Amino acid sequence: MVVAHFIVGNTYPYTVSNWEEDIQDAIAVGIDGFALNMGSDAWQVERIEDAYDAAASVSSDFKLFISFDMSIISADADFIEGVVRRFADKPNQLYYDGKVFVSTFAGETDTFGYSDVSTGWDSAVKEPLASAGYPIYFVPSWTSLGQGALEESVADGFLSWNAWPTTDADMNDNDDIGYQNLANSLGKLYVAPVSPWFYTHLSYKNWAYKSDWLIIDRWNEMLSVQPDMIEVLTWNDYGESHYIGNIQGALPAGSEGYVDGFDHTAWRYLMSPYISAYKLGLSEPYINFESLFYWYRPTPKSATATADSLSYPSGGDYMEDEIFVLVYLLQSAEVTVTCGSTTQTFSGVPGVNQFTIPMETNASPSFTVARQGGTLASGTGPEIVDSLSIYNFNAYTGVLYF
């Protein structure tokens, strides 16, 4: 199964029709469900009610479950138990092994007054739910514990949050292999995270992670690791720039400058052959359609923001001043990428193709695919500029189907 992490905190304006659009968009690329990551605001429970009704209207197969964001919610066992029971009987609730699937972000230091985290989660949350007839399959994201997370007796599985390179290096999957190995020997579930990007630029968090080809490197790792389950980070965390859904709902204060106009449609559509291959157990993506995808940052990484109340983001120098072009082909084709005076024509071959050209500012990149001299696809991305009012290491993306 492949689900996407969903920020319920961004849904204050949502109606059911907003939920239906997200769920349709997720299904269209092969995503099976949403982890509904919720905070403490009472209106979030009402929006989650709408999420389950929307799921029922769209597809009986689409799965939903609660992720308690314990970085926001206090260790309130009554609240947690009550939310699990409120949605456990909905038709689209995800079950595993006959038990209610329940996840978290964090919570590894919450003991609910008990001597340790497993005694606390078990005595305050797990056993009360079991006694009421709702035993849960508890899959917290407790990455600060490392391999200790899977060793916690209260955990039935473990969702890692280690989705990004934290240095100048490419991503690697050593941790995923270790976690899946330990899940295998302990009889537990490992959920691996998959994220296309990272940029956050707010008064309380401000950094980038080396992204660039990350979405392809990570999906290649997933096809090799073959984790039990995958959670995509994220459908809609606008504040950290790894959203792959359509921008709707509410943007976190301070993020609008680097989110508005930065459509990430390409990042969800490009995942479909990798999701298919993951489900089929294949070592390479299952390519049965053709498409060009592109993405790039809006400025050179060295640009000095002209009116930013925040400082330059740590990690901004890690990325490359390049335009990224991904082409899925069933037959050979000629791919031309132009940005101002910078141009290159590439020989695309069947399968996955990865091309780059250097950024050039004050120009709008153009992309063409041709075959037997005839144009199959042509499009233009947003203009790259020398600087913006704020530091912006989010990416524009685009799709050209053909």
- Token pair for 53: 């009704």
d(Cα 202, Cα 204) in Å, to the nearest integer? 5
d(Cα 39, Cα 11) in Å, to the nearest integer? 11
- Token pair for 334: 């000629």
User: Using an 8 Å Cβ cutoff, are 135 and 99 in contact?
Assistant: yes
Cα 86 to its chain centre, rounded Å, is 26
CATH class of the 291-401 domain in this structure: mainly beta
* Superfamily name and number for 2-280: Glycosidases (3.20.20.80)
User: Using an 8 Å Cβ cutoff, are 387 and 303 in contact?
Assistant: yes
Instruction: Tell me the domain boundaries of the chain.
Output: 2-280, 291-401
* Closest C-alpha to 271, from 334, 351, 335, 215: 215
d(Cα 279, Cα 263) in Å, to the nearest integer? 27
- In the chain, which residues are followed by a C-to-N distance beyond 2.5 Å, i.e. a gap? none
| CB neighbour list of residue 146: distance below 8 Å, 6 or more residues apart | none
| CB neighbour list of residue 26: distance below 8 Å, 6 or more residues apart | 4, 33, 34, 62, 235, 245, 268
| CB neighbour list of residue 388: distance below 8 Å, 6 or more residues apart | 257, 298, 299, 303, 305, 306
Give just the sign of the alpha carbon dihedral 245, 247, 248, 251: positive
What is the rounded radius of gyration, in angstroms, for the C-alpha atoms of the chain?
A: 22
* Closest C-alpha to 220, from 170, 289, 269, 184: 170
- Token pair for 283: 């070592």
d(Cα 161, Cα 231) in Å, to the nearest integer? 9
Query: Using H for helix, E for strand and C for coil, what is the string for the chain?
Result: CEEEEEEHHHCCCCCHHHHHHHHHHHHHHCCCEEEEEECCCHHHHHHHHHHHHHHHHHCCCCEEEEEEECCCCCCCHHHHHHHHHHHHCCCCECEECCEEEEEEECCCCCCCCCCCHHHHHHHHHHHHHHHCCCCEEEECCCHHHCCHHHHCCCCCEEECCCCCCCCCCCCCCHHHHHHHHHHHHHCCEEEEEECCCCEEEECCEEEECCCCCHHHHHHHHHHHHCCCEEEECCCCCHHHCCCCCCCCCCCCCCCHHHHCCCCCHHHHHCCHHHHHHHHHCCCCCCCCCCEEEEEECCCCCCCCCCCCCCCCCECHHHCCCEEEEEEEECCCEEEEEEECCEEEEEEECCEEEEEEEECCCCECCEEEEEECCEEEEEEECCCECCCCCCCCCCCEEEEEEC
User: Using an 8 Å Cβ cutoff, are 28 and 57 in contact?
Assistant: no
User: Using an 8 Å Cβ cutoff, are 248 and 402 in contact?
Assistant: no
User: Using an 8 Å Cβ cutoff, are 380 and 366 in contact?
Assistant: yes
- Say what the resolution is, in angstroms: 1.8
Cα distances (angstroms) measured from residue 254 to each of 120, 262, 368 = 36, 15, 36
d(Cα 191, Cα 179) in Å, to the nearest integer? 9
d(Cα 209, Cα 197) in Å, to the nearest integer? 7
Beta bridge partners of 397: 295
